[PDB]
A paper describes a structure:
Legionella pneumophila, a bacterial pathogen that causes a severe pneumonia known as Legionnaires’ disease, extensively exploits the ubiquitin (Ub) pathway in the infected host cells through certain virulence effectors excreted by the Dot/Icm system. L. pneumophila utilizes four OTU-like DUBs, namely LotA (Lpg2248), LotB (Lpg1621/Ceg23), LotC (Lpg2529/Lem27), and Ceg7(Lpg0227), which mimic the function of host DUBs to increase infectivity of the pathogens. LotA is unique among other OTU DUBs because it possesses two distinct DUB domains and exclusively exhibits catalytic activity against K6-linked diUb and polyUb chains. Full-length LotA consists of two DUB domains and a C-terminal PI3P-binding domain connected to the remainder of the protein via a disordered region.
Two LotA molecules and a total of four Ub moieties are present in the crystal asymmetric unit. The structure reveals that both DUB1 (1–267 aa) and DUB2 (287–542 aa) exhibit a classical papain-like fold like typical OTU DUBs. Notably, in the complex structure, DUB1 domain binds two Ub moieties within a cleft formed between the two subdomains of DUB1, whereas no Ub was observed to be bound to the DUB2 domain despite its ability to react with Ub-PA like other cysteine-dependent DUBs. Like in other cysteine-dependent DUBs, the C-terminal tail of the distal Ub is inserted into the catalytic cleft of the DUB1 domain and forms an isopeptide bond with the catalytic cysteine C13. The C-terminal tail of the second Ub is exposed to solvent, that is, it is remote from the catalytic cleft and no isopeptide bond is formed between them. We therefore conclude that this pocket corresponds to the proximal Ub-binding site S1’, which provides a plausible explanation for the presence of a Ub band in the results of the size-exclusion chromatography with LotA1-542–Ub-PA in Fig. S1A. Moreover, close examination of the interface between proximally and distally bound Ub moieties reveals that residue G75 in the C-terminal tail of distal Ub is located only 4.9 Å from the residue K6 of the proximal Ub. Of note, the conformation of the LotA DUB1-bound K6-linked diUb adopts an extended conformation that lacks Ub-Ub interchain interactions.
Residue numbers in the entry:
A (entry chain A): 2 to 277, 284 to 520
B (entry chain C), D (entry chain E): 1 to 75
C (entry chain B): 2 to 243, 245 to 520
E (entry chain D): 1 to 73
F (entry chain F): 1 to 71
Write the structure that this text describes.
């Protein structure tokens, strides 16, 4: 029995459980429970977290756990998913924060009104329990120290005996505001995954996933579901496993993911889908002020693809072209005509066909991603406000012409959007918080009054005749040149490394292997 | 009725309880008397870990009996 | 009217205008000027200074200002941007230096010839004005005292009577070069933001921003542009602001840990508010082209090519007053500390061979350190698969000796190439007992053996287990710092991680397609 | 014509100027005579702040008009 | 480079550092995040107490390694 | 701890000091960068004249405070 080490980022419980559950998923022992509500929720959260989890099935999920088989890769792709799914089983955070606040003041009444610092306070009980871990997780400058000041103020009214019950009743009478605000902060704490966890805080989830968690070998003889054994020595969680399965289903690929814990939980950097380093497409930017020969983005990308195809033809392979026809069958049976392309003067007919294909492919991808990004995530729309298409849409509010050029922004000249846009009470807009008005608007224009935002899912069909989808159809049309942003999705689909030089990037050569 | 809870500190907790109360209820009552949150609580009776949702009558916890409280670790 | 204090690093004018301008942008009263060329220049300079300002626009400018609400945060974000944009509006520099020099001679010619020190001279005029502040700010030892010497030397020919008009004329005749050199030294002053500033030194920019700087309540009711009210007591600028001050400032605490100097240099990226995403289009990049050992073209080594890329990033960054890449380099190798001017001087068409040798040596040391750190890290026991070890570039180089392929054991490219001890050890291996696809069954325990010694068990290697002091692995590793080691893209990967740059590697025949982009 | 600029120390300068000149030009002349950099110069005529780009004729400055020169403070 | 530091309750804090940082530097970052004066911070890597003036790479503390923080006199 | 000292022209320079430093140490630094010997340096914070002997922490010189230099 070997101890597999989980990253100590504060979510070591979620990391360890991610690893053990990973061996169980590949190991096949959970193929019975796989269609149950719990593992359907697991799948749904996995697809909710990874926009490139393209076929929504467990076939794909087991693929992912097999490809990204580094234990850190596993944590990076599954621990945020388990975290998200765990949130769906918390029940009474109101009572929890009440208990945490009463613990704080109960054990630190004099400490607080004496002006002590947070690190000087008593945060542990007589049995070693953590007295207020969620409160403790909040940032010191932003929240904790101000809270100690506010408690110092309202404690001037505390005219009772110092007991836990008296403190609870006191905080119910005099800190309803404070409790509400603390609830907002803790529920939206972006570093929540780092606050340290006990096993039972996950119990709900684990029961929905049919797994018991064994803490330091203290097993429940009465419990007889499949287990995940966890060692906890110095306030850290590791997972025990048998040597045999250790070597077959963990660390059977190289480490592939270069991304921080926070980046993983936040969704900033998407993970690429498993592939079965790549070929490269190399472009160089030009400006509108100073174009080269004025090529649009789709033309340049298509030329790159054709070069990759012809190269692979010399070595007697059609890999890339095959990948193209799987994306667009309209191109199958064009291999020879493409191979015969004089890239000095390339045939305009064929090239316009290829560009059209590319535009439709990039539409399919952008719409899939936008739909993933409008999915309700408990009030958080940061992934949505980072979307290139939402950025192009919101560029119309403060209408700088450079962001509304018709050749690059699909929404540039949509009259209905410009209407709704110009008819917004801008005084109701909080500066730097235009998103607060823009993301509901967007959602409306994408799904209509027919579907409440909080009900949007990966499956919620966007409303037809929507001005959003109407505007994005402009990328299919040929007066749309496109930008590197669209070429990013094209680079996703064709599995190539897209390298874009600037107008003035220098190239130094060296001799290499 | 009334039950007792002994932990490794040597301190003993006195709980007023009815046999239909659940283990979750008992944990909550401990969290009212002491400060310890139920997610860090393990309650033992007769060498058996008591699960939430089942009642005290389900384990024959009767008047003036005693349970062991043991800290569940966090990490 | 409430008064907001601005930090006193010496750019208190730029800090104060930063705060007041932030109130005016957040209030909405400047939305009409969004399209004007002044504010487009402002958004451009802001983008040039902050790489994570992705949607380069008014909305995200407002987002940053509402996010970095604390006034010190604002100064760190915006005072360097305003300082940079102001330089785009300086018309009379030549006249300015010439006049400062005539002031320095005309009020201290006697003092200049009597060997008076710089602190002894008269720098203040009869109206309280500062006579030569731009000169005043330069370094004493490197510039000001030698200036006094060069002036005393030139002043031998001054045989006219000591009048200001005279001194000016004489100076345009006999100090033409002196003035030129001083103009270069002033426009390159690394601490020019800390000399004093009057309101009118910003006029060209304020005018372009449709804003009037009102100093100490001295208003011009005829002027109807939006006004930033400044207050100067004891040679320091603060901002008045009206309902507004509480609405748009100091609502959140200070989020940035940055010195003024680090901000103006742009040493660490300000991270964008969480609502926005990174473009990474403009992340600094090194673009290389492989040539083969058969046909090497001009036959440069990997370190030469990479160093050239870095230098280019350095100069391009100096264009908008950022020393980011260079200060990172000095962070990695203190011996680079004093070559900023020498790097900006490098002609990329015929680069100075000795300085380039210095930079290459630096790169070899940096990649040596990073590579062996990665070695130790990758040798910590995880799995019996050794999934991180068998993928480690240097372990693969070690294993290339087993397959005997001369292309993978070139002394130029593989640091373990002719390791006599290693090759002895591998001569003692029953290769029949080694089945294909399982060479690492023997190579991994051999490697670890040579690295840490026979005594220690591979399952017990932590981050604290030190390599054998005699380890032939480390001594083969030491060739990375040798001239004859050309390096490969493998070695350049670690450098890409160290300088936080994106490495792009063209193949010798890779084509590049141009296209128009925003 | 010949005009004067007065100082809050009562000191007066005499300046040979022509009505077509600019306030920027008058500031340059004040610099040539006294040494005040125009960046630290403010000119007031008949209680009005004088703009760099306008002309003495624009404000009706006549022969032997008195202007006032105040120090723009540095900081 | 990201380093983690863990408290007695298991709460963990993310620090951004470089291999060349001294232990005094890391303790100053911890002061910035949690308010502990460095004289009351005690950092331990793997059983080994960390000494001020020595560098992060002197203990071979690499990316995403975890230090243990404890309060002192 | 970065402190600034400001002349009567508004020109400021930056000094890296500790609260335990006394005004003698500072005056020596100013002498190193600007040449003025401590005899002719007179430093003022918050309208108080500052005397060589007591320390920055006693006059309450904080993180980025600014002092006045006059002769």
């Amino acid at each position: 029995a070997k101890t597999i080490k989980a990253t100590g980022d504060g979510a070591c419980l979620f990391n360890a459980v991610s690893i053990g559950l990973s061996v169980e998923i590949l190991s096949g022992r959970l193929d019975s429970q796989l269609d149950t509500p719990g593992y359907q929720a697991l799948l749904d959260e996995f697809a909710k977290h990874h926009p490139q989890f393209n076929p929504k099935s467990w076939k794909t999920l087991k693929e992912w756990l097999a490809y990204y088989n580094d234990t850190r890769d596993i944590e990076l792709i599954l621990a945020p998913v388990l975290f998200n799914l765990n949130q769906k089983y918390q029940d009474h955070l109101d009572e929890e924060i009440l208990n945490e606040l009463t613990n704080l003041v109960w054990k630190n009444k004099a400490n607080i009104e004496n002006g002590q610092a947070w690190f000087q306070l008593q945060n542990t009980g007589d049995l070693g329990e953590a007295l207020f871990p969620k409160l403790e997780n909040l940032d010191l400058k932003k929240d904790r120290a101000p809270l100690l000041d506010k408690l110092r103020e309202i404690l001037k009214d505390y005219k009772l005996e110092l007991t836990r019950e008296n403190v609870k009743q006191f905080l119910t009478e005099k800190a309803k505001e404070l409790l509400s605000a603390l609830k907002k902060k803790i529920s939206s704490d972006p570093h929540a995954f780092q606050r340290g966890y006990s096993c039972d805080e996950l119990k709900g989830m684990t029961d929905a996933l049919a797994i018991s968690l064994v803490e330091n070998r203290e097993e429940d003889i009465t419990d007889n579901r499949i287990k995940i054994r966890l060692e906890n020595q110095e306030e850290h969680w590791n997972v025990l496993c048998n040597e045999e399965d250790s070597e077959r289903f963990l660390d059977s690929t190289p480490s592939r993911l270069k991304m921080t814990s926070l980046e993983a939980y936040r969704g900033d950097k998407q993970v690429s889908a498993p592939t079965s380093e790549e070929p490269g497409v190399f472009l160089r930017e030009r400006t509108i002020d100073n174009p080269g020969l004025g090529n649009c983005a789709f033309y340049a990308f298509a030329i790159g693809l054709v070069n990759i195809i012809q190269e692979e033809a010399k070595y007697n392979r059609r890999t890339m072209f095959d990948r193209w026809v799987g994306l667009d069958r309209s191109i199958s049976g064009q291999y020879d005509e493409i191979l015969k392309l004089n890239l000095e003067d390339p045939d305009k007919e064929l090239l316009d066909r290829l560009q059209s294909s590319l535009r439709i492919v990039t539409y399919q991808y952008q719409i899939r991603e936008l739909r993933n990004v409008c999915v309700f995530r408990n009030g958080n729309y940061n992934r949505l406000t980072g979307n290139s298409n939402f950025v192009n849409f919101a560029a119309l509010y403060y209408g700088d012409p450079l962001d509304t050029d018709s050749r690059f922004n699909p929404f540039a000249d949509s009259v209905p959007i410009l209407i709704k846009m110009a008819n917004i009470d801008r005084d109701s807009v909080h500066p730097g918080h235009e998103n607060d008005v823009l993301v509901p608007l967007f959602l409306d224009l994408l799904y209509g009054d027919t579907t409440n935002p909080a009900d949007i899912t990966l499956e919620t069909e966007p409303k037809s005749d929507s001005p959003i989808i109407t505007a994005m159809n402009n990328i299919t049309q040929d007066f749309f040149w496109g930008t590197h942003l669209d070429l990013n999705y094209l680079a996703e689909a064709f599995e190539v490394n897209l390298h874009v030089l600037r107008n003035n990037s220098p190239i130094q050569e060296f001799v290499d292997i | 009725m009334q039950i007792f809870v002994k932990t490794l500190t040597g301190k003993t907790i006195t709980l007023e309880v009815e046999p239909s109360d659940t283990i979750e209820n008992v944990k909550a009552k401990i969290q009212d008397k002491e400060g310890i949150p139920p997610d860090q609580q393990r309650l033992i009776f007769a060498g058996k870990q008591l699960e939430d949702g089942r009642t005290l009558s389900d384990y024959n916890i009767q008047k003036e009996s005693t349970l062991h409280l043991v800290l569940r670790l966090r990490g």
